[PDB]
Amino acid sequence: VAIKMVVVGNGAVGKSSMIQRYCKGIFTKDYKKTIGVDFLERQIQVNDEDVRLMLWDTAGQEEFDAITKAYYRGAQACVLVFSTTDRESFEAISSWREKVVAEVGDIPTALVQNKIDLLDDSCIKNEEAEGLAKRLKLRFYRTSVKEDLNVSEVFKYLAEKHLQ
Numbered sequence: 001v002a003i004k005m006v007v008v009g010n011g012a013v014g015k016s017s018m019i020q021r022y023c024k025g026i027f028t029k030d031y032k033k034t035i036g037v038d039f040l041e042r043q044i045q046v047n048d049e050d051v052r053l054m055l056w057d058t059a060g061q062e063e064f065d066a067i068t069k070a071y072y073r074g075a076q077a078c079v080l081v082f083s084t085t086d087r088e089s090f091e092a093i094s095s096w097r098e099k100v101v102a103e104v105g106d107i108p109t110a111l112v113q114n115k116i117d118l119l120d121d122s123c124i125k126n127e128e129a130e131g132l133a134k135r136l137k138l139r140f141y142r143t144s145v146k147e148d149l150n151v152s153e154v155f156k157y158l159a160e161k162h163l164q
């Protein structure tokens with residue numbers, strides 16, 4: 001069981017960091033993270049199935065309005081990411097959802113609030129984040145890529161939803 005997954009959202013929310021954390025077990029201090037290939041990979045056991053997850057990176061092209069059709073094509077699951085400290089990233093989420101739906105239709109999707117380790121400087125109230133999850137009817141995670149909190153859980157959930 002091989003699965004292509006996309007991770008989308010505004011720039012600097014921590015998308016590349018999330019993929020690096022899940023597939024390599026690392027977190028670096030750089031202001032911007034880079035992946036040198038189309039996707040990183042992790043092989044896991046899910047309900048007696050050997051599953052191979054392939055997580056595709058946007059290559060920073062969201063800041064230049066230039067994400068290609070090839071990025072989205074074939075996707076079987078999706079992570080929508082916004083940042084705790086970035087008001088604009090939260091407001092953009094429903095539009096990112098439409099971009100994916102337009103390309104591949106309905107696929108298992110999770111909503112993610114990253115950088116929860118910086119909660120004292122939060123630009124989004126809990127009720128606001130929950131209100132969005134309810135409206136889009138999506139599983140919602142409070143995540144810290146930095147502290148490795150609720151990263152692995154997201155991809156496991158999505159893998160299980162693909163199989164059932």
Ligand SMILES: Nc1nc2c(ncn2[C@@H]2O[C@H](COP(=O)(O)OP(=O)(O)O)[C@@H](O)[C@H]2O)c(=O)[nH]1
Pocket residue numbers: 010011012013014015016017018028029030031032033034060114115116117118143144145146147
């Ligand atoms: N404090 C904190 N910083 C993070 C977290 N995740 C990513 N970052 C940082 O946010 C910046 C942007 O990360 P990046 O992966 O390049 O975001 P992307 O543009 O969405 O791919 C980098 O400096 C990361 O180290 C987190 O959970 N907490």
Ligand SMILES: [Mg+2]
Pocket residue numbers: 015016017033058059060
């Ligand atoms: Mg990136």
